[PDB]
Amino acid sequence: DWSLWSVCSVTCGNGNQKRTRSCGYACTATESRTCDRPNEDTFRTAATEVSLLASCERWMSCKSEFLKKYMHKVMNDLPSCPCSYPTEVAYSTADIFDRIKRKDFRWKDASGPKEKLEIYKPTARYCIRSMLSLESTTLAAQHCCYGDNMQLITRGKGAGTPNLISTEFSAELHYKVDVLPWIICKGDWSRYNEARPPNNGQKCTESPSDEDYIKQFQEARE
Amino acid sequence: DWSLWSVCSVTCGNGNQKRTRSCGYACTATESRTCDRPNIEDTFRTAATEVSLLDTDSCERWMSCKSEFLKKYMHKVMNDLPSCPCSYPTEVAYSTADIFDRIKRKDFRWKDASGPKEKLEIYKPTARYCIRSMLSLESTTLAAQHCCYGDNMQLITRGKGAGTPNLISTEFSAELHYKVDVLPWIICKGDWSRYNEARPPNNGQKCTESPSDEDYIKQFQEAREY
Ligand SMILES: *[C@@H]1O[C@H](CO)[C@@H](O)[C@H](O)[C@@H]1O
Numbered sequence: 001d002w003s004l005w006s007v008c009s010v011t012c013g014n015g016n017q018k019r020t021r022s023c024g025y026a027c028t029a030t031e032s033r034t035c036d037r038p039n040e041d042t043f044r045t046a047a048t049e050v051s052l053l054a055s056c057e058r059w060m061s062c063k064s065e066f067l068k069k070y071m072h073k074v075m076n077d078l079p080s081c082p083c084s085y086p087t088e089v090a091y092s093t094a095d096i097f098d099r100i101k102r103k104d105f106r107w108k109d110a111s112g113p114k115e116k117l118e119i120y121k122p123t124a125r126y127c128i129r130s131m132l133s134l135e136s137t138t139l140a141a142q143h144c145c146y147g148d149n150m151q152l153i154t155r156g157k158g159a160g161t162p163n164l165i166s167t168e169f170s171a172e173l174h175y176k177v178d179v180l181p182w183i184i185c186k187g188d189w190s191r192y193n194e195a196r197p198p199n200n201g202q203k204c205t206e207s208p209s210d211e212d213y214i215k216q217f218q219e220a221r222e
Numbered sequence: 223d224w225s226l227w228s229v230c231s232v233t234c235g236n237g238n239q240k241r242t243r244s245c246g247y248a249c250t251a252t253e254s255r256t257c258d259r260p261n262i263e264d265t266f267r268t269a270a271t272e273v274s275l276l277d278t279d280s281c282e283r284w285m286s287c288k289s290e291f292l293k294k295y296m297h298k299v300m301n302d303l304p305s306c307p308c309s310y311p312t313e314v315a316y317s318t319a320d321i322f323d324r325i326k327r328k329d330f331r332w333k334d335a336s337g338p339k340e341k342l343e344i345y346k347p348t349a350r351y352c353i354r355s356m357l358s359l360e361s362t363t364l365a366a367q368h369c370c371y372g373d374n375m376q377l378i379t380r381g382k383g384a385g386t387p388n389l390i391s392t393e394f395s396a397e398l399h400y401k402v403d404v405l406p407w408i409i410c411k412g413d414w415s416r417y418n419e420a421r422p423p424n425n426g427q428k429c430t431e432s433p434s435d436e437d438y439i440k441q442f443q444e445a446r447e448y
Pocket residue numbers: 001002003
């Protein structure tokens with residue numbers, strides 16, 4: 001039978017709410033929905049540490065003090081990736097608590113058509129994206145992509161590469177900062193992923209496997 | 223309609239398959255199923271030696287079981303197990319770390335029990351983090367100390383989100399642990415006060431009681447409705 005609907009996860013904002021239908025033997029049905037409660041963030045937060053606080057080879061050899069410092073702090077703020085696909089993000093928009101950054105972070109499903117998974121992350125099956133917090137230190141957004149078994153793909157052509165600019169701030173600025181260099185360097189993930197390092201904060205098992213990672217490398221260098 | 227079954231989560235081990243399904247607006251329905259593949263080292267060794275060498279309500283009947291095995295085993299469980307730490311061991315957020323029990327004067331290994339498969343939202347709705355003790359090579363039982371903590375990282379001694387010891391750990395079996403340490407708790411409709419008197423939370427280090435007297439009482443009238 002059914003079970004309880006949980007609590008609306010937040011009062012001072014907008015949250016999520018989950019139920020455990022919990023079916024029969026060796027099976028467990030759950031179900032999640034987002035809930036609403038009342039109460040100049042995207043364009044007036046990073047501007048405080050920027051506006052006043054101030055070919056493929058030439059790109060990934062750029063030692064800009066702005067770009068370097070920003071990227072450092074990006075990895076010193078962004079949450080980890082989930083070790084598994086948060087199923088409750090398929091049709092809803094889910095909330096995950098990063099145990100390392102000790103905070104709640106909001107995630108939208110980035111497996112849509114405008115993502116074009118067959119193009120950018122051709123190993124993956126699903127992708128998810130961090131969302132600009134109300135107290136976001138940056139305009140960034142953790143990207144994470146998963147496989148057919150729903151586990152995180154750590155290294156390679158389809159992996160969670162942090163995006164300097166999120167689609168919430170701008171889908172075109174993101175595309176021309178976090179994708180335009182990736183298409184310049186002909187899909188060479190090994191050339192891209194060293195400048196834009198994927199993230200495995202919760203330290204999940206490495207994938208694709210050692211042998212299969214290498215076959216990818218020798219194909220991606222041609 | 224529904225969606226895919228998805229692939230077994232692991233081949234070199236034992237995993238699951240999860241299925242999503244069209245829900246309502248801003249909802250997401252899902253369901254999980256178990257999957258088995260061959261490769262439980264010391265689980266079926268030290269325990270098996272300790273096992274063989276030893277107008278009516280269902281929840282009442284469970285809490286009315288005078289099994290000499292159950293009572294004897296439980297006594298030695300609350301003697302093998304370590305005390306709960308007063309605070310949250312930060313370094314465990316990944317998965318695992320080793321801390322030292324002052325009472326037992328020994329090291330014990332702990333795993334982070336704060337995942338989504340846990341659903342802290344439901345089973346320990348006060349708590350923010352949870353951790354469980356791990357089956358030591360010299361463990362006398364299949365049990366495991368559960369301890370759940372709060373926003374301020376401190377142990378929640380009483381109430382709906384508390385460290386209720388598990389007679390059977392996930393390491394030995396996830397299904398037998400469910401059907402011994404969770405199934406009666408589901409039976410006794412989320413009644414922590416009914417459950418916890420028979421499966422008593424532990425505060426061996428005698429940290430400050432939490433939640434406070436004021437809020438603990440607020441929990442009384444609420445939690446015995448749902
Ligand atoms: C789900 O919730 C309960 C079952 O536990 C009932 O009110 C009803 O069957 C509903 O479908």
